[PDB]
Amino acid sequence: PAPELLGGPSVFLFPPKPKDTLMISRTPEVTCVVVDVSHEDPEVKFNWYVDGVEVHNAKTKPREEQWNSTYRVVSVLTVLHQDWLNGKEYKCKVSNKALPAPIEKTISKAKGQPREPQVYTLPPSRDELTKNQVSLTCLVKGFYPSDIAVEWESNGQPENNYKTTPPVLDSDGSFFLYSKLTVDKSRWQQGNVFSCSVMHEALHNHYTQKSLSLS
Amino acid sequence: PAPELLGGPSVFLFPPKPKDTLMISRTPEVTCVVVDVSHEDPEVKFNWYVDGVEVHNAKTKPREEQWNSTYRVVSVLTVLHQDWLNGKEYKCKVSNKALPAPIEKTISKAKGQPREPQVYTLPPSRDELTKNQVSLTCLVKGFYPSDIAVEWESNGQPENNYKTTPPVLDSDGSFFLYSKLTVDKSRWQQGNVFSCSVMHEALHNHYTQKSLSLS
Amino acid sequence: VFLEPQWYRVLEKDSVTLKCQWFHNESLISSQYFIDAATVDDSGEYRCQTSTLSDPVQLEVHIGWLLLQAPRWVFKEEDPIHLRCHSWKNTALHKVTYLQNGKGRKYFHHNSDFYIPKATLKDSGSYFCRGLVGSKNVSSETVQITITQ
Ligand SMILES: *[C@@H]1O[C@H](CO[C@@H]2O[C@@H](C)[C@@H](O)[C@@H](O)[C@@H]2O)[C@@H](O[C@@H]2O[C@H](CO)[C@@H](O[C@@H]3O[C@H](CO[C@H]4O[C@H](CO)[C@@H](O)[C@H](O)[C@@H]4O[C@@H]4O[C@H](CO)[C@@H](O[C@@H]5O[C@H](CO)[C@H](O)[C@H](O)[C@H]5O)[C@H](O)[C@H]4NC(C)=O)[C@@H](O)[C@H](O[C@H]4O[C@H](CO)[C@@H](O)[C@H](O)[C@@H]4O[C@@H]4O[C@H](CO)[C@@H](O)[C@H](O)[C@H]4NC(C)=O)[C@@H]3O)[C@H](O)[C@H]2NC(C)=O)[C@H](O)[C@H]1NC(C)=O
Ligand SMILES: *[C@@H]1O[C@H](CO[C@@H]2O[C@@H](C)[C@@H](O)[C@@H](O)[C@@H]2O)[C@@H](O[C@@H]2O[C@H](CO)[C@@H](O[C@@H]3O[C@H](CO[C@H]4O[C@H](CO)[C@@H](O)[C@H](O)[C@@H]4O[C@@H]4O[C@H](CO)[C@@H](O[C@@H]5O[C@H](CO)[C@H](O)[C@H](O)[C@H]5O)[C@H](O)[C@H]4NC(C)=O)[C@@H](O)[C@H](O[C@H]4O[C@H](CO)[C@@H](O)[C@H](O)[C@@H]4O[C@@H]4O[C@H](CO)[C@@H](O)[C@H](O)[C@H]4NC(C)=O)[C@@H]3O)[C@H](O)[C@H]2NC(C)=O)[C@H](O)[C@H]1NC(C)=O
Ligand SMILES: *[C@@H]1O[C@H](CO)[C@@H](O[C@@H]2O[C@H](CO)[C@@H](O[C@@H]3O[C@H](CO)[C@@H](O)[C@H](O[C@H]4O[C@H](CO)[C@@H](O)[C@H](O)[C@@H]4O[C@@H]4O[C@H](CO)[C@@H](O)[C@H](O)[C@H]4NC(C)=O)[C@@H]3O)[C@H](O)[C@H]2NC(C)=O)[C@H](O)[C@H]1NC(C)=O
Ligand SMILES: *[C@@H]1O[C@H](CO)[C@@H](O)[C@H](O)[C@H]1NC(C)=O
Ligand SMILES: [Cl-]
């Protein structure tokens, strides 16, 4: 449908981290990266539009020389947490002499009705208690959109050794995922408490946690 | 209209399905796919090699019109189960008049010590028992390579209402995944035994089963 | 014994024209020479006569998307080094990088020759070019350049 472009700089527009959009102590940023800027036309211009309304206040970094002898230039627009969640479009317009016409890229939060995750912690299987380490599982399902943050905690500090699957599309159009916390078996049997924490837009205070311990 | 296709066609070479390599009754296939074949130079010639030696058993599929006025053109070589698992390289050589030379592509099983999967079934959280459906969970971890197949059954019949996460790289270089089977709560309350079936080269007879029921 | 264009390393389907002051691999020809659309068989040693018998001049025909052409591979300090990143059938090449010893040295949005006007000992190393033919990443083979005094 769209006739393909020739050489020239290229533009990549990146959204904010989910966890940054949801906790108000954090500062979420939209990031507009221009690569393949030649030394012959190294000057790059960033215009930034929210829903159509130009904004200024974007903080443009200075061009950095890449190992392949091209320039790379980043512009970082700080975003208001609620503007992102209400789903306002963010537009990076990149202008440069090697471009016949400026390049525009747009991003926004995935559209669709938000849905609250259900969170269930699952102890280690009985068969696993044979091993030196064991697996505490946190199942998170029924969420939409797929934007989410999941962490494990214990005694107020973040647990180290955990991996979380990518979001998977369940058959009702919602998403689930699983996160696995691996701990030494001593800590489980000695009876410490482990929490699985979940941040998602459709939860009250964008937060919930669920405890897990032996009994 | 037509696209320019300046670089000619491109080749994507795909492996067999994990279950097809692991059950002797099934037929594993390597699939060479060629895209961006033009209307004007649509013929594709295939040469297939196993550890450098030419083989002639490949199947030629009728070419497929795509919705951008190119052909998707495919050749499918069935393979020997043991060869694939023994790490034989399968080379697809693709010739077309819009190329300056043949494109060659190779594929083998991932290399490195195979590691046995550990399989663990996990009953629903007590908090899910209020719902009308429950989630039975199968954790499969500690396996290498990532090639694996997972299915569920009850009472000699397949249970198909499940979803499985992709394999995830764990911190020791092995893989894990979760599979979630969703069943009507009545069925779990009746005392029915559900089973998680896992296939992987590092298992005995490429097969193992763990079971899960009300206690 | 003169090549038009000068490039002694050429690609399949390249036009060559050959000027005199013919023997192909020491053997007689059709005519008394225009190579319309080169093939690998047109490679080899070439000599000229109508005058004396000329020196031996090599024409290498290569197969590939890209070929790093130059008038020679050994240069004097301060000599001009002309590189052409030649694409098969002069197919449009974009986002072209010329590399030296594994590091991108010059980048061009559209294909362009990389002319170094004044060579130095720093310019010794292996060079290749690469780029995009449409969406396809392609690279030429390497060529060794060495700089002397
Ligand atoms: C010359 O070199 C440069 C750079 O050099 C590099 O460094 C050297 C040493 C080497 O290692 C070299 O290989 C390195 O690249 C080359 O520049 C590269 O150019 C290519 C394109 O040719 C770019 O490739 C795209 O990458 C995208 C992903 O990029 C991110 O991830 C990669 C790793 O996978 C990182 O390396 C990048 O830096 C990017 O990482 C992200 O950066 C963000 C901004 O900082 C981060 O977000 C921010 O995080 C901070 C916190 O730090 C805050 O929280 C902010 O709020 C937050 O915004 C983010 O965390 C970080 N991610 C990480 C670390 O994972 C791909 O998306 C893209 O693919 C899309 O586009 C292709 C078209 O070309 C297409 O084919 C693909 O299919 C895909 O399609 C698109 O899909 C998207 C979404 O799915 C849709 O928009 C579209 O539908 C669709 N099509 C589109 C948009 O057209 C490419 O793979 C590469 O990023 C770029 N590198 C850098 C560093 O800029 C250059 O090419 C070289 N030139 C030559 C001539 O050789
Ligand atoms: C014109 O149109 C055509 C047609 O396009 C399509 O139709 C229209 C309507 C659109 O909707 C469009 O989106 C459709 O796709 C265009 O054709 C496409 O071209 C792109 C490239 O431009 C191809 O993209 C690659 O896809 C690979 C994965 O492909 C599979 O998955 C997708 C879905 O995700 C399917 O749609 C594909 O068909 C492939 O599906 C697989 O097919 C196999 C063979 O059928 C199946 O295996 C077999 O299964 C059967 C049963 O059916 C038997 O059991 C056999 O035993 C078994 O063999 C397989 O199951 C099936 N999977 C499914 C369905 O899930 C990507 O892998 C690839 O990415 C790699 O390469 C990129 C380079 O371009 C690079 O960016 C990536 O990083 C990645 O690179 C690799 O990374 C890995 C590690 O991550 C490394 O190991 C590698 O080293 C590394 N580099 C490589 C390999 O170079 C591509 O993204 C796309 O496949 C193709 N479509 C089709 C249908 O073939 C065409 O481009 C258009 N042209 C123009 C000019 O517009
Ligand atoms: C003047 O002198 C020069 C310098 O000596 C000659 O250059 C030589 O030309 C040869 C062919 O014309 C070049 O051969 C090519 O390069 C490969 C070297 O690695 C070579 O392997 C290839 O050779 C083919 O023929 C062989 C059979 O005898 C095969 O072993 C080989 O695989 C190739 O044949 C094809 O193989 C595939 C396999 O899948 C078959 O399916 C095909 O059917 C086969 N045939 C065809 C037609 O494709 C390759 O062609 C040689 O390298 C080159 N040397 C140099 C240094 O450049 C000039 O030709 C000569 N000029 C004249 C007019 O005589
Ligand atoms: C082409 O492939 C190389 C090899 O990995 C990579 O470094 C390069 O950036 C790719 N793209 C281009 C435009 O050169
Ligand atoms: Cl990202």
Numbering used by the authors:
A (entry chain A), B (entry chain B): 230 to 444
C (entry chain C): 10 to 30, 42 to 52, 56 to 73, 76 to 174
Can you list sentences taken from the study reporting this PDB entry?
The Fc region of IgG1 possesses one conserved N-glycosylation site (Asn297) in each CH2 domain, where a bi-antennary complex-type oligosaccharide is expressed with microheterogenities resulting from the presence or absence of non-reducing terminal fucose, galactose, and sialic acid residues. Namely, removal of the core fucose residue from Fc glycans causes dramatic enhancement of ADCC through improved IgG1-FcγRIIIa interaction. Crystallographic studies have indicated that binding of IgG1-Fc to FcγRIIIa is mediated not only by protein-protein interactions but also by carbohydrate-protein and carbohydrate-carbohydrate interactions.
For crystallization, we used a soluble form of FcγRIIIa (sFcγRIIIa), which consisted of the extracellular domains and possessed two N-linked oligosaccharides at Asn45 and Asn162, while the remaining three N-glycosylation sites were mutationally eliminated. In this crystal structure, electron density of the Asn162 glycan was again largely unobservable. In this context, the results of our MD simulations indicate that core fucosylation of Fc glycan also intramolecularly perturbs the amino acid residues in close spatial proximity, as best exemplified by Tyr296, which neighbors the N-glycosylation site in Fc chain A. The aromatic ring of Tyr296 of nonfucosylated IgG1-Fc is sandwiched between the Asn162 glycan and the Lys128 side chain of sFcγRIIIa. In the presence of the IgG1-Fc core fucose, this major conformational state is significantly less populated, giving rise to divergent minor conformational states, which are exemplified by χ1 dihedral angle of −55° and also by direct contact with the fucose residue in Fc chain A glycan. In the crystal structures of the IgG1-Fc/ sFcγRIIIa complexes, clarity of electron density of the sFcγRIIIa Asn162 glycan depended on the presence or absence of the core fucose residue of the IgG1-Fc glycans. Our REMD simulations successfully extrapolated this missing information, revealing that the Asn162 glycan is stabilized in solution mainly through carbohydrate-carbohydrate interaction with the nonfucosylated form of Fc glycan, which, however, is sterically hindered by the core fucose of Fc.
